[PDB]
Amino acid sequence: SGFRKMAFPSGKVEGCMVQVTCGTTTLNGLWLDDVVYCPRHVICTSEDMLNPNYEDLLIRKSNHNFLVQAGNVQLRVIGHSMQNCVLKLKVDTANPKTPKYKFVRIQPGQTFSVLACYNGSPSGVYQCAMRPNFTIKGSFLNGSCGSVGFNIDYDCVSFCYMHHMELPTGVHAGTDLEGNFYGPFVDRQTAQAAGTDTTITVNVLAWLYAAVINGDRWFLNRFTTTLNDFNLVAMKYNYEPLTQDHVDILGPLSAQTGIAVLDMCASLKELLQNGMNGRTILGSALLEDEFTPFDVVRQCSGVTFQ
Amino acid sequence: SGFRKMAFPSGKVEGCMVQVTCGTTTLNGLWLDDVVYCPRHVICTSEDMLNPNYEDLLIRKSNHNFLVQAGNVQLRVIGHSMQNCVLKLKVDTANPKTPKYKFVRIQPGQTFSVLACYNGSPSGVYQCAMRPNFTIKGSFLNGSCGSVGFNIDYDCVSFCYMHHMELPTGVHAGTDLEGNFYGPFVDRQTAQAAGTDTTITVNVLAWLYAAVINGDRWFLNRFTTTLNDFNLVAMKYNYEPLTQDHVDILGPLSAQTGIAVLDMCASLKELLQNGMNGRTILGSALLEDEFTPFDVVRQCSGVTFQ
Ligand SMILES: *[C@H](O)[C@H](C[C@@H]1CCNC1=O)NC(=O)[C@@H]1[C@@H]2[C@H](CN1C(=O)COc1ccc(Cl)cc1Cl)C2(C)C
Numbered sequence A, B: 001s002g003f004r005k006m007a008f009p010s011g012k013v014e015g016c017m018v019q020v021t022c023g024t025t026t027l028n029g030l031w032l033d034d035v036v037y038c039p040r041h042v043i044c045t046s047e048d049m050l051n052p053n054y055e056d057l058l059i060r061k062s063n064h065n066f067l068v069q070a071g072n073v074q075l076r077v078i079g080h081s082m083q084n085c086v087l088k089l090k091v092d093t094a095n096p097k098t099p100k101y102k103f104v105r106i107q108p109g110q111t112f113s114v115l116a117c118y119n120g121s122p123s124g125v126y127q128c129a130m131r132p133n134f135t136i137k138g139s140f141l142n143g144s145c146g147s148v149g150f151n152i153d154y155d156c157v158s159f160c161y162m163h164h165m166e167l168p169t170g171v172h173a174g175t176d177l178e179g180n181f182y183g184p185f186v187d188r189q190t191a192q193a194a195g196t197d198t199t200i201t202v203n204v205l206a207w208l209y210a211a212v213i214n215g216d217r218w219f220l221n222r223f224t225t226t227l228n229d230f231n232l233v234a235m236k237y238n239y240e241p242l243t244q245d246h247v248d249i250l251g252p253l254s255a256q257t258g259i260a261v262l263d264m265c266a267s268l269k270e271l272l273q274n275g276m277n278g279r280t281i282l283g284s285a286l287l288e289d290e291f292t293p294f295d296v297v298r299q300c301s302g303v304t305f306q
């Protein structure tokens, strides 16, 4: 037993990370087959990153302007092109470490592992959720652009995120691996802001089920509630509405614990109105919302990946 | 910016994990050079694990009783020996993936990354602290024994932990890689219990400095305190005593923020006596104690590993 914010093993992704330097900008790239993927603002400079015109900037570039460091070995760039907000640098060598992979775009509420990287070298790994406002609460410093987020499903890495920027509230924004931003953000230095977030209701319920599975039961009660009456409380506390599909997705957790989904909602209702009163749930004094039902089933059952 | 519970990249360790099966017990082993390391209770059975005599049990074993699966390839065991609570299985093949490594024993209060494994296959990675009572609050199910904890320091993996068991409170106990248990636990099924824990004071202060670096400042104050008067409050709230060396270790964080260590103690004192009053620190409603000063400096500065 026990319950931890757990990332996927990062080894398959570590073998794809490279360093991309252009001008005085160094960031990370993702090397799959004979392509290196990286944020397009690597082609920018100081006075560029204001309201840049990346098509103009890119046509002024040459293959040899892009220095690609795969560890202690330089990769020759033989072509370049822009795809939305990412660059695709064609290199003369296919990555012999290329795992089988997919480029997937995730939904707010879903989670993924981030391999934070600097100068092409992995620094750490942690779990993030896509917030309802399409930001992520990460840990990113200068030089971390091009770090990717991913999930693993048996032997296949599903890349879902490339890091591009921090917003003024300290949260982070980036793209899918096709270069399309999550949320209404642009890779310019403007006065853009996150905008209002909500709590991921279905995830909080999943985490409550994780707690019960692990022996935290004090928040349970004989009360129940209808979906509609629960959702008026959710709205009041800036929680996302709970749909019937969310109830369906929680079914296996409900069946394992023997606590009906709607009964757990009644428990969440009471926690929202009364707080916790000095008690904790799974070592937390806050209702946690960055674990999906899948995450709970995976950890409380022990799935692996080859 | 941002602050996350961050593990080390796990790739170097993933290449060492194997499956060890003996009788009807399957667990994980750690394959370094031509030795596989695993918990010695793999040689036990159901009626064995009560008050077993492992020397007697081991002399009754044969090299061929140990099935070692390195992925889809079987490793021939050519020798075996017991070292305290671990087995060393000599195999005919050296692991060509062996990273440079060390076997180190850590102190309570220090942190490490755990690569949770089942059937020799990595499942996830997360950060743990050695509690003052020599347990760890992990996430471990049946089959996870032999998963290791580790730190990475440039290119070198310092293995500090092998998993053996869960205690009745849901916390976890294991050994260093020389097979010596952390704390007063034995690899028998007895009525052993964790015993009383304390909060790691120096780590809480480090995390408060992490908060300030990341813009959470509401808990700061003009008050100060002496080390002695702080330590009477620490004792009252079941916090570990703060030593002058702890103050020294916090020096760089103090110097970066411009908040004297003893002034941050005064802030912790007030948080201990008043609570947080509905506010959070780094997304937590509890004082967090599983980040060392090193962890904070590493994350709030961006060190990597090759
Ligand atoms: C690429 O390595 C960086 C990663 C940034 C640096 C600090 N934290 C990060 O995640 N990306 C950028 O520097 C991008 C780049 C231009 C601006 N930018 C930003 O991150 C915006 O800036 C900030 C905004 C808010 C904060 Cl709290 C901090 C910073 Cl540095 C492009 C937008 C072109």
Ligand SMILES: *[C@H](O)[C@H](C[C@@H]1CCNC1=O)NC(=O)[C@@H]1[C@@H]2[C@H](CN1C(=O)COc1ccc(Cl)cc1Cl)C2(C)C
Binding pocket: A001, B027, B041, B049, B140, B141, B142, B143, B144, B145, B146, B164, B165, B166, B167, B168, B169, B170, B171, B172, B186, B187, B188, B189
């Ligand atoms: C080896 O894979 C397991 C790992 C255990 C299983 C559940 N969680 C874990 O970390 N190790 C064991 O089964 C060891 C083994 C005998 C008993 N044992 C225990 O973990 C003790 O048991 C438990 C105690 C408390 C709880 Cl809450 C659950 C269990 Cl299963 C040796 C002590 C020989």
